[PDB]
């Protein structure tokens, strides 16, 4: 899977959502989140992010290493809807991301 990390927080450019063939990038209040059970490693999202927030799981930097679990935790109550388009923005951000001070 690919992973959205800290640079997305309170930026949310949303260039990435255009590119994903399976529509598995979902919007929270603070950032977007890649569904790890829906992502099939197409990689089309990663080049388009203007703040380089997106990484393949194995390439997520140590300083943001907790963001992979955060992406999974976003879907605790959503399950696997099988497409972000119908869900829209939801207030499902995990505690760890909710607690970050305002950025940008
Ligand atoms: S800021 Fe976020 S919303 Fe997508 S284009 Fe970059 S990951
Ligand atoms: S384009 Fe979609 S399939 Fe995964 S690698 Fe990016 S979220």
Curated annotation (Swiss-Prot):
Write one Pfam family the protein is assigned to.
Fer4
Annotated 4Fe-4S ferredoxin-type domain ranges read 30-59
Extract the ranges annotated as region (Disordered): 81-104
Record text on cofactor binding: Binds 1 [4Fe-4S] cluster. Binds 1 [3Fe-4S] cluster.
Name the source's superkingdom: Bacteria
Instruction: Enumerate the cofactors the protein uses.
Output: [4Fe-4S] cluster; [3Fe-4S] cluster
Iron-sulfur: present as a keyword of the record?
A: yes
Against InterPro entries, the record matches this protein to: 4Fe4S_Fe-S-bd, 4Fe4S_Fe_S_CS, 7Fe_ferredoxin, FdxA_Actino, RnfB_subfamily
| Gene Ontology molecular function, alphabetical | 3 iron, 4 sulfur cluster binding; 4 iron, 4 sulfur cluster binding; electron transfer activity; metal ion binding
Q: Tell me the residue numbers annotated for binding [4Fe-4S] cluster.
A: 20, 39, 42, 45
Does the keyword field hold Metal-binding? Answer: yes
Keywords linked to the UniProt accession = 3Fe-4S, 4Fe-4S, Electron transport, Iron, Iron-sulfur, Metal-binding, Repeat, Transport
Listed binding positions for [3Fe-4S] cluster are 8, 16, 49
* Role: Ferredoxins are iron-sulfur proteins that transfer electrons in a wide variety of metabolic reactions.
The name under which this protein is listed is Ferredoxin
**What taxonomic ancestry is recorded?**
Bacteria, Bacillati, Actinomycetota, Actinomycetes, Mycobacteriales
């Amino acid at each position: 899977t690919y992973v959205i990390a800290e640079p997305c927080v309170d930026v949310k450019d949303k260039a990435c959502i255009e590119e994903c063939p399976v529509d598995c990038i979902y919007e929270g209040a603070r950032m977007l989140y890649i569904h790890p059970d829906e992502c099939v490693d197409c990689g089309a999202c990663e080049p388009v992010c203007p703040v380089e927030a997106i990484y393949y799981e194995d390439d997520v930097p140590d300083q943001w290493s907790s963001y992979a679990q955060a992406n999974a935790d976003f879907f605790a109550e959503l399950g696997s809807p099988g497409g972000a388009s119908k869900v829209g923005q939801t207030d499902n951000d995990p505690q760890a991301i909710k607690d970050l001070p305002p950025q940008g």
